[PDB]
Amino acid sequence: SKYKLIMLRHGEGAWNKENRFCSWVDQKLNSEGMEEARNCGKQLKALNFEFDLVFTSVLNRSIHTAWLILEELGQEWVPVESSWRLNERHYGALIGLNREQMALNHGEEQVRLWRRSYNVTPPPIEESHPYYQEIYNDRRYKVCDVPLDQLPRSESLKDVLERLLPYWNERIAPEVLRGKTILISAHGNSSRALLKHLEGISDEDIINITLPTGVPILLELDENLRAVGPHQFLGDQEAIQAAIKKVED
Amino acid sequence: SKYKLIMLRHGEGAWNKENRFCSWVDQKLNSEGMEEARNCGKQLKALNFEFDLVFTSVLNRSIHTAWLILEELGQEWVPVESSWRLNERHYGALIGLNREQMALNHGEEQVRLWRRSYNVTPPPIEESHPYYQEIYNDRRYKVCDVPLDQLPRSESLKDVLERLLPYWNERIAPEVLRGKTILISAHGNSSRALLKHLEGISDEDIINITLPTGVPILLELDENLRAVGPHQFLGDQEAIQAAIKKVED
């Protein structure tokens, strides 16, 4: 492979356990999630990875994961760049609720698509939503490449890929093609959407892809930046199968 | 005034109490050095500071200081930018040695200059210094705005100001004039050189300015980015003397 890039997702937290979607709520990593980031950094140091640039989202759990890895690598000097286009999927009005609360207010049949389909967008988050203010009042969203009102109020995995692509093509890809070793600290859907694009996965298969957290996901790309072969999880097989088992269902 | 800018320095280490100059050696902050960064962040949060951009050096103690402040401010998303031109003063061959040792190899009168003068450059570091490789083998310096061999091998307070100016003028100044609230996590001489320039301090008076660590240094600039008065230390007026008196001993 002419190029190699590493990617991973932070460890999910308390909400994920209760089957709730943190989404764009800027929750901090818990003890377990901070341990994953460290162990991941140790794993990369053990593989002598030397990064030249780092890309993260605007959500602090993404960033803190990157910081802990850089500290473990002793590469805190590596430029770090953040963007909302790398943010987790915006679940709209479904933010906060568990599976049962969703079926109750929207319809079981209706809820199925929203979590298991590739292009069905959940209903938009509204002024009346408990977390509406906390997201849009945040001044980090007042300095994006698009005005606050032009940002997502809900998203499908397809939507995510569509606002992520611009960032890959305009900011990240040029750096890979320039010989740089990149690290991408992302989220569940963020990383999922980028893998679909680089690996050419169908709309039907993208849904079933396994994405363990706290695990380095190595991608070997050719001259067109298209993945050569399957992405590989780096680290000991035990730690991997436990992580995989954790993102099941 | 019309513009504002916050500067500060990291807590000194063990070497500094042994009266040794860490200089460009990339030492990590100690327990003491990290608590200062946090308390400083808490002090800024307490003052409702909202930064739009952050500048640090390439030495990790500078960076970690910034990260701890951003975390305390809940502004981990603020872009961070690092440069060697913000690095601590390069003390040349004097890196490592203590007072007793410097004299033993150079002379009480000759060393008194290199430490208390504004323009006398210490001898350069030789390829035989214990810390030479540790500094020039590092890849963080193989990606600077000037080739590795062209980096200072020692410096005077004047030298520091001369390689810092290009970065103020070209990178930071434009952002201040653009309405942005900047934060600069620097070092002893770095912060000293910058204040001298912006406040128009003499070569003799500069030597005596008291630069407490872990303290927010507010600077109000006019339209020409010149100091509109003297810089001011912010925070609990109680803890501020604990900072100055400690720096004065």
Tab-separated table of C-alpha atoms in Angstrom:
chain	number	residue	atom	x	y	z
A	1	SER	CA	0.000	0.000	0.000
A	2	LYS	CA	1.416	3.379	-0.987
A	3	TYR	CA	-0.139	4.958	2.168
A	4	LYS	CA	-1.098	4.033	5.753
A	5	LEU	CA	-3.536	5.857	8.018
A	6	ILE	CA	-4.778	5.087	11.535
A	7	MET	CA	-8.243	5.701	12.886
A	8	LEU	CA	-10.187	4.808	16.012
A	9	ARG	CA	-13.179	5.816	18.095
A	10	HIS	CA	-13.197	6.808	21.774
A	11	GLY	CA	-14.819	4.458	24.282
A	12	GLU	CA	-18.577	4.972	24.689
A	13	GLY	CA	-19.840	6.071	28.105
A	14	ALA	CA	-22.702	5.854	30.622
A	15	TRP	CA	-25.442	6.776	28.143
A	16	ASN	CA	-24.402	4.111	25.677
A	17	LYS	CA	-24.784	1.508	28.451
A	18	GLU	CA	-28.366	2.601	29.075
A	19	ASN	CA	-28.811	2.369	25.312
A	20	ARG	CA	-29.085	6.145	24.932
A	21	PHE	CA	-27.342	8.182	22.259
A	22	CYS	CA	-24.996	10.878	23.479
A	23	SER	CA	-24.803	12.131	19.892
A	24	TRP	CA	-23.793	15.808	19.834
A	25	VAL	CA	-24.152	16.291	23.577
A	26	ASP	CA	-20.556	17.129	24.601
A	27	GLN	CA	-20.114	14.543	27.338
A	28	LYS	CA	-16.632	13.878	28.678
A	29	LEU	CA	-14.953	10.467	28.641
A	30	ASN	CA	-15.464	8.437	31.823
A	31	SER	CA	-12.726	6.463	33.611
A	32	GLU	CA	-13.043	3.455	31.261
A	33	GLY	CA	-12.957	5.607	28.115
A	34	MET	CA	-9.825	7.409	29.315
A	35	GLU	CA	-8.136	4.036	29.900
A	36	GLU	CA	-8.913	2.933	26.352
A	37	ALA	CA	-7.275	6.051	24.932
A	38	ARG	CA	-4.155	5.429	27.006
A	39	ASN	CA	-3.892	1.703	26.234
A	40	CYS	CA	-4.437	2.617	22.606
A	41	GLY	CA	-1.545	5.080	22.769
A	42	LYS	CA	0.638	2.430	24.407
A	43	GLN	CA	-0.343	0.031	21.645
A	44	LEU	CA	0.686	2.585	18.994
A	45	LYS	CA	3.930	3.422	20.788
A	46	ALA	CA	4.598	-0.338	20.907
A	47	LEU	CA	4.173	-0.308	17.129
A	48	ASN	CA	6.460	2.755	16.854
A	49	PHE	CA	3.878	4.908	15.150
A	50	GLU	CA	5.034	8.399	14.308
A	51	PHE	CA	2.176	10.740	13.406
A	52	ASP	CA	2.668	13.992	11.570
A	53	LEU	CA	-0.855	15.306	11.942
A	54	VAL	CA	-4.026	14.601	13.898
A	55	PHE	CA	-7.705	15.146	13.053
A	56	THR	CA	-10.533	15.133	15.566
A	57	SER	CA	-14.101	16.353	15.984
A	58	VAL	CA	-15.387	19.296	18.004
A	59	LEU	CA	-16.745	16.990	20.736
A	60	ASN	CA	-14.278	16.890	23.628
A	61	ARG	CA	-14.364	13.092	24.045
A	62	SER	CA	-12.796	12.853	20.578
A	63	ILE	CA	-10.114	15.419	21.420
A	64	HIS	CA	-9.213	14.104	24.896
A	65	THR	CA	-8.755	10.661	23.349
A	66	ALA	CA	-6.263	12.184	20.917
A	67	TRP	CA	-4.400	14.044	23.696
A	68	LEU	CA	-3.974	10.885	25.779
A	69	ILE	CA	-2.604	9.034	22.749
A	70	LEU	CA	-0.164	11.840	21.909
A	71	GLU	CA	1.041	11.938	25.507
A	72	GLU	CA	1.607	8.174	25.436
A	73	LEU	CA	3.499	8.590	22.183
A	74	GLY	CA	5.421	11.579	23.456
A	75	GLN	CA	4.170	13.435	20.377
A	76	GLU	CA	2.149	16.214	22.027
A	77	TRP	CA	3.778	18.574	19.496
A	78	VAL	CA	2.014	16.951	16.506
A	79	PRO	CA	-0.468	19.454	15.031
A	80	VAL	CA	-4.050	18.690	16.035
A	81	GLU	CA	-6.982	19.900	13.942
A	82	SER	CA	-10.689	19.746	14.893
A	83	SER	CA	-13.890	19.855	12.843
A	84	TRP	CA	-17.621	19.302	13.387
A	85	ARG	CA	-17.612	17.328	10.108
A	86	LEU	CA	-15.977	14.617	12.187
A	87	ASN	CA	-18.702	14.825	14.885
A	88	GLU	CA	-20.734	11.777	15.869
A	89	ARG	CA	-24.016	11.271	14.032
A	90	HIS	CA	-26.707	13.750	14.990
A	91	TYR	CA	-29.655	11.641	16.145
A	92	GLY	CA	-32.040	14.584	16.117
A	93	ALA	CA	-34.931	14.366	18.573
A	94	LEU	CA	-33.882	10.841	19.506
A	95	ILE	CA	-30.978	12.263	21.515
A	96	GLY	CA	-31.218	11.121	25.119
A	97	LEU	CA	-34.055	8.610	24.900
A	98	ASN	CA	-33.580	4.844	25.230
A	99	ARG	CA	-35.061	2.279	22.812
A	100	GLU	CA	-38.438	2.074	24.603
A	101	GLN	CA	-38.921	5.862	24.881
A	102	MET	CA	-38.345	6.110	21.111
A	103	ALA	CA	-40.904	3.467	20.105
A	104	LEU	CA	-43.438	5.100	22.437
A	105	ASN	CA	-43.215	8.612	20.995
A	106	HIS	CA	-42.631	7.660	17.343
A	107	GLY	CA	-43.744	4.137	16.548
A	108	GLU	CA	-41.840	0.866	16.675
A	109	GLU	CA	-42.119	0.475	12.908
A	110	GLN	CA	-40.868	4.050	12.501
A	111	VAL	CA	-37.971	3.607	14.943
A	112	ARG	CA	-36.621	0.519	13.154
A	113	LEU	CA	-35.491	2.462	10.095
A	114	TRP	CA	-33.839	5.284	12.028
A	115	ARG	CA	-31.262	3.050	13.742
A	116	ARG	CA	-30.960	0.198	11.225
A	117	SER	CA	-31.184	1.969	7.830
A	118	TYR	CA	-28.550	3.887	5.890
A	119	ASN	CA	-30.620	6.801	4.522
A	120	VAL	CA	-33.650	7.417	6.755
A	121	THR	CA	-33.206	10.594	8.757
A	122	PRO	CA	-34.671	10.719	12.275
A	123	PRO	CA	-36.944	13.660	13.071
A	124	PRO	CA	-35.173	17.014	13.674
A	125	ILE	CA	-34.229	18.097	17.179
A	126	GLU	CA	-36.373	21.033	18.289
A	127	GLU	CA	-36.282	24.091	20.536
A	128	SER	CA	-38.404	22.108	23.002
A	129	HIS	CA	-35.821	19.322	23.290
A	130	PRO	CA	-33.955	19.129	26.638
A	131	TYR	CA	-30.576	19.296	24.878
A	132	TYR	CA	-31.363	21.741	22.081
A	133	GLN	CA	-29.954	24.805	23.856
A	134	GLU	CA	-26.816	23.081	25.178
A	135	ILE	CA	-25.784	22.189	21.617
A	136	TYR	CA	-26.614	25.322	19.608
A	137	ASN	CA	-25.700	27.869	22.313
A	138	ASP	CA	-22.155	26.506	22.377
A	139	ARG	CA	-19.892	29.060	20.744
A	140	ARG	CA	-17.861	26.331	19.023
A	141	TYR	CA	-20.710	26.012	16.556
A	142	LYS	CA	-20.567	29.757	15.797
A	143	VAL	CA	-17.192	29.395	14.064
A	144	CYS	CA	-17.721	26.471	11.638
A	145	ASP	CA	-17.463	26.554	7.841
A	146	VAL	CA	-21.240	27.009	7.768
A	147	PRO	CA	-23.518	29.249	9.886
A	148	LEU	CA	-25.187	27.847	13.003
A	149	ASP	CA	-28.636	27.715	11.345
A	150	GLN	CA	-27.150	25.759	8.415
A	151	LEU	CA	-25.939	22.905	10.661
A	152	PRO	CA	-27.657	19.492	11.123
A	153	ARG	CA	-30.692	19.099	13.362
A	154	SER	CA	-30.737	15.330	12.687
A	155	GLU	CA	-28.901	12.857	10.465
A	156	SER	CA	-28.818	9.473	8.757
A	157	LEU	CA	-25.528	7.617	8.233
A	158	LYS	CA	-25.779	8.867	4.665
A	159	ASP	CA	-26.069	12.440	5.890
A	160	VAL	CA	-22.990	11.932	8.058
A	161	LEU	CA	-20.951	10.656	5.083
A	162	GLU	CA	-22.133	13.632	3.007
A	163	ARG	CA	-20.872	16.305	5.439
A	164	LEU	CA	-17.749	14.291	6.259
A	165	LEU	CA	-16.669	13.783	2.616
A	166	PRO	CA	-15.938	17.496	2.009
A	167	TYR	CA	-13.514	17.389	4.927
A	168	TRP	CA	-11.785	14.215	3.783
A	169	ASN	CA	-11.358	15.488	0.209
A	170	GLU	CA	-10.379	19.070	1.044
A	171	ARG	CA	-8.366	18.731	4.266
A	172	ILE	CA	-7.316	15.176	5.131
A	173	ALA	CA	-6.630	13.437	1.801
A	174	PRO	CA	-4.147	16.077	0.565
A	175	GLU	CA	-2.043	15.327	3.648
A	176	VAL	CA	-2.019	11.569	3.080
A	177	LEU	CA	-0.991	12.116	-0.546
A	178	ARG	CA	1.783	14.294	0.829
A	179	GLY	CA	3.374	11.378	2.671
A	180	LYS	CA	2.080	12.180	6.163
A	181	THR	CA	1.091	9.663	8.806
A	182	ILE	CA	-2.346	10.692	10.033
A	183	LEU	CA	-4.402	9.803	13.080
A	184	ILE	CA	-8.147	10.246	13.101
A	185	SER	CA	-9.850	10.376	16.507
A	186	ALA	CA	-13.514	9.874	15.602
A	187	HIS	CA	-16.849	8.538	16.806
A	188	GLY	CA	-19.080	5.614	15.964
A	189	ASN	CA	-20.776	6.966	12.856
A	190	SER	CA	-17.936	9.309	11.952
A	191	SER	CA	-15.547	6.370	11.591
A	192	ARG	CA	-18.208	4.180	10.058
A	193	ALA	CA	-19.023	6.731	7.338
A	194	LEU	CA	-15.366	7.224	6.400
A	195	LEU	CA	-14.726	3.467	6.151
A	196	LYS	CA	-17.700	2.997	3.813
A	197	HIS	CA	-16.222	5.588	1.457
A	198	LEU	CA	-12.603	4.409	1.544
A	199	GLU	CA	-13.440	0.697	1.393
A	200	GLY	CA	-16.321	1.038	-1.063
A	201	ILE	CA	-18.879	-0.694	1.147
A	202	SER	CA	-22.503	-0.963	-0.018
A	203	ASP	CA	-25.488	0.779	1.618
A	204	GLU	CA	-26.651	-2.634	2.821
A	205	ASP	CA	-23.387	-3.859	4.343
A	206	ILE	CA	-22.281	-0.612	6.025
A	207	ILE	CA	-24.840	-1.273	8.744
A	208	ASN	CA	-23.296	-4.605	9.871
A	209	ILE	CA	-19.641	-3.515	10.049
A	210	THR	CA	-17.984	-4.113	13.440
A	211	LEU	CA	-16.340	-1.094	15.014
A	212	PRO	CA	-14.605	-1.783	18.353
A	213	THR	CA	-13.644	1.235	20.458
A	214	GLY	CA	-10.197	1.983	21.878
A	215	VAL	CA	-8.715	-0.099	19.043
A	216	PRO	CA	-6.322	1.189	16.333
A	217	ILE	CA	-7.854	0.653	12.901
A	218	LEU	CA	-5.104	0.513	10.276
A	219	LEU	CA	-5.993	1.339	6.698
A	220	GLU	CA	-3.580	0.780	3.783
A	221	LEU	CA	-4.513	3.022	0.824
A	222	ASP	CA	-3.369	2.995	-2.803
A	223	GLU	CA	-2.616	5.969	-5.101
A	224	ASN	CA	-6.316	6.885	-5.330
A	225	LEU	CA	-6.645	6.693	-1.556
A	226	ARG	CA	-8.883	3.618	-1.835
A	227	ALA	CA	-8.350	0.906	0.777
A	228	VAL	CA	-6.269	-2.014	-0.436
A	229	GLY	CA	-7.829	-5.057	1.212
A	230	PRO	CA	-9.647	-5.082	4.593
A	231	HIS	CA	-8.934	-2.631	7.435
A	232	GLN	CA	-6.976	-4.266	10.262
A	233	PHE	CA	-7.385	-3.939	13.996
A	234	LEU	CA	-3.970	-3.498	15.670
A	235	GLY	CA	-3.259	-5.061	19.030
A	236	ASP	CA	-3.645	-8.388	20.807
A	237	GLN	CA	-6.496	-10.573	19.576
A	238	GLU	CA	-7.927	-10.955	23.089
A	239	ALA	CA	-8.379	-7.220	23.637
A	240	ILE	CA	-9.879	-6.999	20.139
A	241	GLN	CA	-12.516	-9.736	20.487
A	242	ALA	CA	-13.623	-8.256	23.824
A	243	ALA	CA	-13.931	-4.799	22.271
A	244	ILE	CA	-15.788	-6.256	19.255
A	245	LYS	CA	-18.158	-8.146	21.570
A	246	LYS	CA	-18.841	-4.828	23.348
A	247	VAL	CA	-20.130	-3.025	20.184
A	248	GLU	CA	-22.383	-5.976	19.308
A	249	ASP	CA	-26.125	-5.667	18.507
B	1	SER	CA	-8.353	49.138	25.191
B	2	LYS	CA	-9.545	47.930	21.789
B	3	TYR	CA	-7.734	44.561	21.940
B	4	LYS	CA	-6.878	41.997	24.642
B	5	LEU	CA	-4.364	39.140	24.978
B	6	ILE	CA	-3.616	36.597	27.710
B	7	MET	CA	-0.129	35.195	28.274
B	8	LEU	CA	1.306	32.908	30.995
B	9	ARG	CA	4.150	30.545	31.859
B	10	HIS	CA	4.285	26.959	33.060
B	11	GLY	CA	5.335	25.985	36.560
B	12	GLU	CA	9.079	25.445	36.837
B	13	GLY	CA	10.586	22.068	37.603
B	14	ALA	CA	13.159	20.457	39.823
B	15	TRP	CA	16.043	21.695	37.683
B	16	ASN	CA	14.920	25.302	38.208
B	17	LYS	CA	15.131	24.965	42.011
B	18	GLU	CA	18.612	23.427	41.562
B	19	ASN	CA	19.185	26.658	39.613
B	20	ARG	CA	19.650	24.741	36.339
B	21	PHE	CA	18.128	25.713	32.989
B	22	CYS	CA	15.868	23.132	31.413
B	23	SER	CA	15.873	25.371	28.321
B	24	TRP	CA	15.108	23.285	25.200
B	25	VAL	CA	15.272	19.940	27.005
B	26	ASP	CA	11.727	18.618	26.717
B	27	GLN	CA	11.006	17.943	30.385
B	28	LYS	CA	7.489	17.178	31.492
B	29	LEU	CA	5.691	19.244	34.106
B	30	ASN	CA	5.945	17.802	37.609
B	31	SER	CA	3.074	17.444	40.084
B	32	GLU	CA	3.561	21.084	41.081
B	33	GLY	CA	3.677	22.233	37.441
B	34	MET	CA	0.380	20.559	36.593
B	35	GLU	CA	-1.586	21.870	39.566
B	36	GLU	CA	-0.626	25.412	38.527
B	37	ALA	CA	-1.989	24.857	35.013
B	38	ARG	CA	-5.287	23.633	36.476
B	39	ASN	CA	-5.631	26.362	39.093
B	40	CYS	CA	-4.827	28.845	36.355
B	41	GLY	CA	-7.608	27.401	34.225
B	42	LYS	CA	-9.995	27.618	37.164
B	43	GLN	CA	-8.970	31.249	37.604
B	44	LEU	CA	-9.686	31.990	33.934
B	45	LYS	CA	-12.987	30.128	34.077
B	46	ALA	CA	-13.768	32.218	37.171
B	47	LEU	CA	-13.104	35.279	35.014
B	48	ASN	CA	-15.303	33.889	32.230
B	49	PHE	CA	-12.529	33.941	29.663
B	50	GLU	CA	-13.439	32.683	26.222
B	51	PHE	CA	-10.445	32.030	23.988
B	52	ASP	CA	-10.688	31.724	20.223
B	53	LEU	CA	-7.170	30.543	19.587
B	54	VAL	CA	-4.158	29.224	21.495
B	55	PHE	CA	-0.423	29.433	20.763
B	56	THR	CA	2.225	27.325	22.476
B	57	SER	CA	5.800	26.190	21.899
B	58	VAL	CA	7.021	22.775	20.777
B	59	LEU	CA	8.165	21.818	24.300
B	60	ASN	CA	5.519	19.574	25.866
B	61	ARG	CA	5.457	21.386	29.206
B	62	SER	CA	4.106	24.423	27.325
B	63	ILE	CA	1.474	22.311	25.549
B	64	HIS	CA	0.242	20.298	28.538
B	65	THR	CA	-0.191	23.572	30.397
B	66	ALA	CA	-2.506	24.756	27.621
B	67	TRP	CA	-4.458	21.488	27.541
B	68	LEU	CA	-5.127	21.582	31.275
B	69	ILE	CA	-6.390	25.149	31.003
B	70	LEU	CA	-8.659	24.340	28.045
B	71	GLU	CA	-10.051	21.357	29.925
B	72	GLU	CA	-10.802	23.535	32.958
B	73	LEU	CA	-12.421	26.068	30.613
B	74	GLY	CA	-14.313	23.391	28.726
B	75	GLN	CA	-12.789	24.833	25.561
B	76	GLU	CA	-10.776	21.828	24.341
B	77	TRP	CA	-12.156	22.629	20.876
B	78	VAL	CA	-10.289	25.946	20.617
B	79	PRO	CA	-7.617	25.554	17.971
B	80	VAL	CA	-4.107	25.118	19.358
B	81	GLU	CA	-1.005	26.055	17.388
B	82	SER	CA	2.630	25.240	18.315
B	83	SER	CA	5.939	26.805	17.274
B	84	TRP	CA	9.586	26.517	18.307
B	85	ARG	CA	9.751	30.324	18.077
B	86	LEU	CA	7.838	30.228	21.344
B	87	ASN	CA	10.376	27.807	22.892
B	88	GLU	CA	12.268	28.641	26.091
B	89	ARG	CA	15.603	30.369	25.692
B	90	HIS	CA	18.323	28.111	24.367
B	91	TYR	CA	21.133	28.271	26.967
B	92	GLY	CA	23.649	26.523	24.711
B	93	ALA	CA	26.337	24.513	26.448
B	94	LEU	CA	24.961	25.744	29.788
B	95	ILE	CA	22.000	23.367	29.487
B	96	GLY	CA	22.008	21.029	32.458
B	97	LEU	CA	24.818	22.459	34.588
B	98	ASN	CA	24.101	24.209	37.898
B	99	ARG	CA	25.562	27.531	39.147
B	100	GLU	CA	28.679	25.956	40.759
B	101	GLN	CA	29.401	24.020	37.550
B	102	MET	CA	28.969	26.921	35.127
B	103	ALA	CA	31.540	28.994	37.013
B	104	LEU	CA	33.934	26.037	37.252
B	105	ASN	CA	34.035	25.896	33.461
B	106	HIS	CA	33.680	29.545	32.426
B	107	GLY	CA	34.135	32.106	35.223
B	108	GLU	CA	31.986	33.864	37.823
B	109	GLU	CA	32.251	37.120	35.876
B	110	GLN	CA	31.564	35.569	32.459
B	111	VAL	CA	28.558	33.550	33.650
B	112	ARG	CA	27.112	36.536	35.519
B	113	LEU	CA	26.713	38.087	32.056
B	114	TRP	CA	25.090	35.148	30.292
B	115	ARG	CA	22.409	35.100	32.983
B	116	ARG	CA	21.843	38.779	33.805
B	117	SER	CA	22.573	40.471	30.450
B	118	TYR	CA	20.167	41.201	27.613
B	119	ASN	CA	22.422	40.577	24.595
B	120	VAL	CA	25.339	38.333	25.528
B	121	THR	CA	24.916	34.891	23.935
B	122	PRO	CA	26.139	31.852	25.889
B	123	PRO	CA	28.481	29.510	24.031
B	124	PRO	CA	26.724	27.271	21.536
B	125	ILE	CA	25.884	23.704	22.447
B	126	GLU	CA	28.459	21.284	20.990
B	127	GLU	CA	27.717	17.853	19.467
B	128	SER	CA	29.377	16.517	22.639
B	129	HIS	CA	26.968	18.074	25.135
B	130	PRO	CA	25.067	15.364	27.065
B	131	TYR	CA	21.743	16.738	25.807
B	132	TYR	CA	22.653	17.584	22.221
B	133	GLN	CA	21.215	14.498	20.466
B	134	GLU	CA	18.267	14.342	22.824
B	135	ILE	CA	17.382	17.728	21.285
B	136	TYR	CA	18.504	17.627	17.627
B	137	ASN	CA	17.641	13.960	16.910
B	138	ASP	CA	14.028	14.853	17.623
B	139	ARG	CA	11.696	14.898	14.666
B	140	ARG	CA	9.674	17.843	15.957
B	141	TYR	CA	12.552	20.024	14.707
B	142	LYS	CA	12.685	18.447	11.228
B	143	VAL	CA	9.444	20.213	10.359
B	144	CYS	CA	10.103	23.804	11.476
B	145	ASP	CA	10.122	26.944	9.313
B	146	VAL	CA	13.901	26.550	9.173
B	147	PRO	CA	16.071	23.442	8.633
B	148	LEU	CA	17.475	21.593	11.654
B	149	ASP	CA	21.035	22.839	11.125
B	150	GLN	CA	19.776	26.424	11.023
B	151	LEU	CA	18.240	26.395	14.528
B	152	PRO	CA	19.862	28.345	17.361
B	153	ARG	CA	22.608	26.434	19.173
B	154	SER	CA	22.395	28.929	22.044
B	155	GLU	CA	20.748	32.296	22.547
B	156	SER	CA	20.616	35.612	24.397
B	157	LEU	CA	17.415	37.242	25.602
B	158	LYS	CA	17.875	39.428	22.505
B	159	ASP	CA	18.262	36.376	20.234
B	160	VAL	CA	15.030	34.964	21.679
B	161	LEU	CA	13.131	38.160	20.866
B	162	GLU	CA	14.485	38.112	17.301
B	163	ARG	CA	13.261	34.615	16.398
B	164	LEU	CA	9.997	35.228	18.257
B	165	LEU	CA	9.130	38.514	16.476
B	166	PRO	CA	8.654	36.845	13.048
B	167	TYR	CA	5.995	34.610	14.620
B	168	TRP	CA	4.230	37.445	16.438
B	169	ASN	CA	4.112	39.613	13.285
B	170	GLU	CA	3.206	36.899	10.780
B	171	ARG	CA	0.999	34.541	12.748
B	172	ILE	CA	-0.350	35.945	16.024
B	173	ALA	CA	-0.728	39.686	15.410
B	174	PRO	CA	-3.098	39.191	12.434
B	175	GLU	CA	-5.446	37.157	14.651
B	176	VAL	CA	-5.556	39.800	17.394
B	177	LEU	CA	-6.347	42.492	14.817
B	178	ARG	CA	-9.070	40.139	13.618
B	179	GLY	CA	-10.939	40.443	16.940
B	180	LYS	CA	-9.819	37.102	18.424
B	181	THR	CA	-9.152	36.448	22.092
B	182	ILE	CA	-5.730	34.741	22.191
B	183	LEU	CA	-3.969	32.703	24.889
B	184	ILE	CA	-0.227	32.144	24.823
B	185	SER	CA	1.234	29.291	26.881
B	186	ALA	CA	4.940	30.209	26.990
B	187	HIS	CA	8.196	29.974	28.926
B	188	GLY	CA	10.344	32.284	31.009
B	189	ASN	CA	12.267	34.075	28.291
B	190	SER	CA	9.567	33.605	25.633
B	191	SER	CA	7.024	35.533	27.689
B	192	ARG	CA	9.709	37.984	28.775
B	193	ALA	CA	10.795	38.741	25.183
B	194	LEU	CA	7.178	39.299	24.105
B	195	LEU	CA	6.293	41.723	26.878
B	196	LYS	CA	9.481	43.709	26.268
B	197	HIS	CA	8.503	44.190	22.644
B	198	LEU	CA	4.834	45.019	23.185
B	199	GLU	CA	5.388	47.292	26.207
B	200	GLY	CA	8.577	48.892	24.908
B	201	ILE	CA	10.755	47.911	27.859
B	202	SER	CA	14.464	48.852	27.877
B	203	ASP	CA	17.337	46.337	27.804
B	204	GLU	CA	18.149	47.229	31.426
B	205	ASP	CA	14.607	47.390	32.768
B	206	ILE	CA	13.626	44.171	31.003
B	207	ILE	CA	16.037	42.148	33.134
B	208	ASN	CA	14.082	42.987	36.293
B	209	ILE	CA	10.450	42.378	35.309
B	210	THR	CA	8.883	39.757	37.617
B	211	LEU	CA	7.231	36.981	35.632
B	212	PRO	CA	5.203	34.724	37.976
B	213	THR	CA	4.230	31.285	36.635
B	214	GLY	CA	0.709	29.853	36.567
B	215	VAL	CA	-0.634	33.404	36.487
B	216	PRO	CA	-2.768	34.985	33.696
B	217	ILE	CA	-0.936	37.989	32.251
B	218	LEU	CA	-3.470	40.345	30.621
B	219	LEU	CA	-2.254	42.795	27.996
B	220	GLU	CA	-4.439	45.523	26.518
B	221	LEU	CA	-3.228	46.577	23.054
B	222	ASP	CA	-4.116	49.594	20.928
B	223	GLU	CA	-4.523	49.731	17.137
B	224	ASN	CA	-0.794	49.269	16.512
B	225	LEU	CA	-0.768	46.290	18.902
B	226	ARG	CA	1.256	48.326	21.402
B	227	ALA	CA	0.760	48.040	25.169
B	228	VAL	CA	-1.843	50.505	26.512
B	229	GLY	CA	-0.364	50.530	29.999
B	230	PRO	CA	1.566	47.804	31.893
B	231	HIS	CA	0.631	44.134	31.726
B	232	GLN	CA	-1.530	43.014	34.653
B	233	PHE	CA	-1.543	39.797	36.645
B	234	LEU	CA	-5.042	38.364	37.092
B	235	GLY	CA	-6.675	36.157	39.728
B	236	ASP	CA	-6.962	36.005	43.530
B	237	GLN	CA	-4.780	38.896	44.712
B	238	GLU	CA	-3.814	36.576	47.569
B	239	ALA	CA	-2.270	33.818	45.433
B	240	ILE	CA	-0.555	36.382	43.170
B	241	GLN	CA	2.035	37.335	45.768
B	242	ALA	CA	2.625	33.649	46.442
B	243	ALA	CA	3.616	33.608	42.783
B	244	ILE	CA	5.821	36.731	42.732
B	245	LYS	CA	7.631	36.196	46.067
B	246	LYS	CA	8.394	32.636	44.989
B	247	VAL	CA	9.809	33.911	41.694
B	248	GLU	CA	11.873	36.329	43.799
B	249	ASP	CA	13.991	33.715	45.587
